[PDB]
Amino acid sequence: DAWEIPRESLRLEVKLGQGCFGEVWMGTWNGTTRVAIKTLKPGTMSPEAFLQEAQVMKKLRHEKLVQLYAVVSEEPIYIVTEYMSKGSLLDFLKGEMGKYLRLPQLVDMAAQIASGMAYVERMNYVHRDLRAANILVGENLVCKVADFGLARLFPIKWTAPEAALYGRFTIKSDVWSFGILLTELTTKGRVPYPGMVNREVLDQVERGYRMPCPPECPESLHDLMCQCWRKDPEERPTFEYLQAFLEDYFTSTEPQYQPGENL
Ligand SMILES: CC(C)n1nc(-c2ccc(NC(=O)Nc3cccc(C(F)(F)F)c3)cc2)c2c(N)ncnc21
Numbered sequence: 001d002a003w004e005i006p007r008e009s010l011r012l013e014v015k016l017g018q019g020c021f022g023e024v025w026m027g028t029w030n031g032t033t034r035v036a037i038k039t040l041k042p043g044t045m046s047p048e049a050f051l052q053e054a055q056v057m058k059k060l061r062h063e064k065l066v067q068l069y070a071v072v073s074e075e076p077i078y079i080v081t082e083y084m085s086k087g088s089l090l091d092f093l094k095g096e097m098g099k100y101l102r103l104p105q106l107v108d109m110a111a112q113i114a115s116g117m118a119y120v121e122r123m124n125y126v127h128r129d130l131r132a133a134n135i136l137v138g139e140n141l142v143c144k145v146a147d148f149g150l151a152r153l154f155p156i157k158w159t160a161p162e163a164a165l166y167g168r169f170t171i172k173s174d175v176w177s178f179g180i181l182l183t184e185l186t187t188k189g190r191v192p193y194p195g196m197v198n199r200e201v202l203d204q205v206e207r208g209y210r211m212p213c214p215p216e217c218p219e220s221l222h223d224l225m226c227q228c229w230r231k232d233p234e235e236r237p238t239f240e241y242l243q244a245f246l247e248d249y250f251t252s253t254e255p256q257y258q259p260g261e262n263l
Pocket of ligand 1: 016034036038053054056057060065066081082083085130145146147148149150
């Protein structure tokens with residue numbers, strides 16, 4: 001197809017990530033546009049299974065979803081996407097920039113992610129792995145949804161009960177994850193359900209347990225989290241709703257908000 005590009009048109013500057021299935025490099029394309037390059041280690045993982053990740057990024061196109069630029073489908077395979085200068089949201093919240101972010105910036109970030117998922121919602125797709133580690137940050141606190149290839153038309157702590165138990169994954173399963181993602185945003189990336197192993201999380205959540213309101217986080221925002229965590233998937237709000245709620249947050253929900261020590 002038209003996504004295919006020559007190999008000499010790619011220059012891999014410095015490596016950013018290094019998994020087992022491949023690597024991620026910061027590079028240049030056509031000697032001008034800065035890009036993100038994903039490599040596949042032949043032998044370790046197989047093609048098509050590594051290319052399916054791009055088969056879906058071809059349909060999806062939204063300013064809040066990491067955009068696919070080009071590919072090299074003939075092994076050695078290379079995936080080219082837009083470059084997000086600040087890395088993963090998770091590393092961003094935990095690093096040097098974490099101490100300065102306050103609720104208005106963090107809620108704005110949640111609004112962008114929600115906007116991106118509203119697009120996924122409209123297109124009838126399921127992400128299956130929405131979490132801070134799969135969100136990328138660019139210049140001027142821009143956030144975009146991304147992943148490794150689970151988009152379909154043990155992260156138990158981020159996975160809704162009905163999905164982790166009976167494999168029932170829906171856009172409502174993602175809404176549950178967005179709720180967990182909101183706790184990651186308000187605790188500066190702390191692993192959710194602190195001091196609890198997966199087996200405790202499963203038993204507890206089914207038993208009705210839910211994380212409490214994080215310190216300095218408005219109750220109105222924690223209530224939004226709890227809606228995302230309702231046992232019945234159909235009672236959870238849509239991303240269209242969460243997008244509007246978050247964008248209008250400081251005028252319609254917390255018009256009295258006063259900055260604090262951490263939020
Ligand atoms: C943190 C570092 C290792 N890294 N990783 C990436 C990167 C981002 C996205 C992807 N893959 C991806 O977004 N896949 C994917 C697969 C299916 C569907 C989608 C969706 F359309 F939902 F975004 C996305 C791979 C590497 C990336 C990037 N683009 N820019 C700057 N740094 C980056």
